[PDB]
A = this chain, B = another copy of it.
Amino acid sequence: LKESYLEESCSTITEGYLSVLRTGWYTNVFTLEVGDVENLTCTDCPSLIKTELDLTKSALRELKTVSADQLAKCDIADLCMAVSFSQFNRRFLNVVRQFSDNAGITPAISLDLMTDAELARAVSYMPTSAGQIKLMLENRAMVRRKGFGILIGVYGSSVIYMVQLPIFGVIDTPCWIIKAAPSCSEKDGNYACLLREDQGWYCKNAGSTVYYPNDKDCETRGDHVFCDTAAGINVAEQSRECNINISTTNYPCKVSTGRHPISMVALSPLGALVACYKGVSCSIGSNRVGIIKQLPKGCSYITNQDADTVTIDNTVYQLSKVEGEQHVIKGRPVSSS
């Protein structure tokens, strides 16, 4: 992580990341069964286990509608079965509950569709070099969050669904992020604003550079950006001379000339850009002293650790997160009997 301030265009580039990109989809098929329940002597009467079985049977029947392939007297013994049924058959119930809640597909691969043991084995079988496989196992919280389970169908008392794990093929390719703010000059009152429109992520692969334009498109897990190959716009590798020289007469860079000053604050990974002109007062302050200085009229770059808040005409911006309070909560004890 190393953020550089470019004063000729009022923008910053942070080049310390490594890119991991998806290059296909894996697939596993699961079949979860309810499990045998010992026969009841009565077989026709209201019992806690029978009511529990009926609810499970009814839940499966309703769940069959949201599919993809085909459709679209108290006794001590009874209590033990009712509790035992919901304990031994817990993974099955959770899968049924999750699919019903999301109505067909879960947003992410929870730890009930595919346990860790099944996840590690699946990753090791993917068609990628050893380098990619090692990285995926190191941080498997992202493969789960990038996949999505799909319900195939329901037959009898079993459930069939697909996981569709992601597959990463390009890893450890250096890349950066670019943030820009307006840079308006002035002669006698008539301004000339130049704002760079090539703002967002920027990562390289396969002899080309991708341009995920939304900061939310690519997640961050330290020195790793888990970009999704669904919004990236491929651009020529020559689209880097803009940083060195905005014009450079070589690669036309996307800029938007203006005529009216704009005052705004843009937050960077390790700082923020403060630009304000002609009317609004700017100042940088911390949680200790809020009178550090008044920013001069222009585009100024302030480090994250140098200041904590920037007030653009009575509007704090909180460069960095603010820590609150820590709580510790413990449940009540479960005494015998």
CB distance from A258 to the nearest CB of B (A): 7
Complex CA distance for A52 and B55, rounded to whole angstroms: 20
Complex CA distance for A242 and B28, rounded to whole angstroms: 41
Q: A31-B326, A77-B337, A321-B27 are in contact. Are A66 and B111 (CB under 8 A)?
A: yes
CB distance from A122 to the nearest CB of B (A): 6
Query: Which one of B40, B82, B88, B264 lies within 8 Å of A336 (CB-CB)?
Result: B40
Query: Which one of B40, B98, B280, B337 lies within 8 Å of A207 (CB-CB)?
Result: B280
Report if A312 contacts B (CB, 8 A).
yes
Q: Are A38 and B100 in contact (CB under 8 A)?
A: no
Q: Which of A107, A115, A207, A325 has the most CB of B within 10 A?
A: A207
Report if A292 contacts B (CB, 8 A).
no
Report if A243 contacts B (CB, 8 A).
no
Report if A156 contacts B (CB, 8 A).
no
How many copies of the chain does the oligomer comprise? 3
Q: A77-B74, A80-B74, A112-B100 are in contact. Are A25 and B321 (CB under 8 A)?
A: yes
Report if A248 contacts B (CB, 8 A).
no
Q: Are A260 and B236 in contact (CB under 8 A)?
A: yes
Name A216-271 residues within 8 Å CB distance of B. 216, 221, 230-231, 234-238, 251, 258, 260-265
Report if A291 contacts B (CB, 8 A).
no
Query: Which one of B251, B327, B334 lies within 8 Å of A85 (CB-CB)?
Result: B334
Taking CB atoms, residues of chain B closer than 8 Å to A317 are: 23-24, 169
Q: Are B112 and A103 in contact (CB under 8 A)?
A: no
Report if A294 contacts B (CB, 8 A).
no
Q: Name which residue of chain B comes closest to A132, CB basis.
A: B316
CB distance from A103 to the nearest CB of B (A): 4
Q: Name which residue of chain B comes closest to A276, CB basis.
A: B207
Q: Are A207 and B313 in contact (CB under 8 A)?
A: yes
Known: A35-B333, A66-B144, A214-B231. 5 other contacts (CB 8 A): A28-B324, A33-B328, A72-B138, A103-B108, A122-B324
The 4 closest A-B pairs by CB, nearest first: A24-B318, A72-B141, A236-B260, A35-B331
Q: List 19 A-B contacts (CB under 8 A).
A: A29-B324, A29-B325, A33-B331, A36-B334, A48-B83, A48-B84, A48-B87, A51-B84, A55-B87, A59-B111, A62-B111, A77-B337, A81-B334, A89-B331, A122-B325, A127-B287, A206-B312, A207-B313, A208-B262
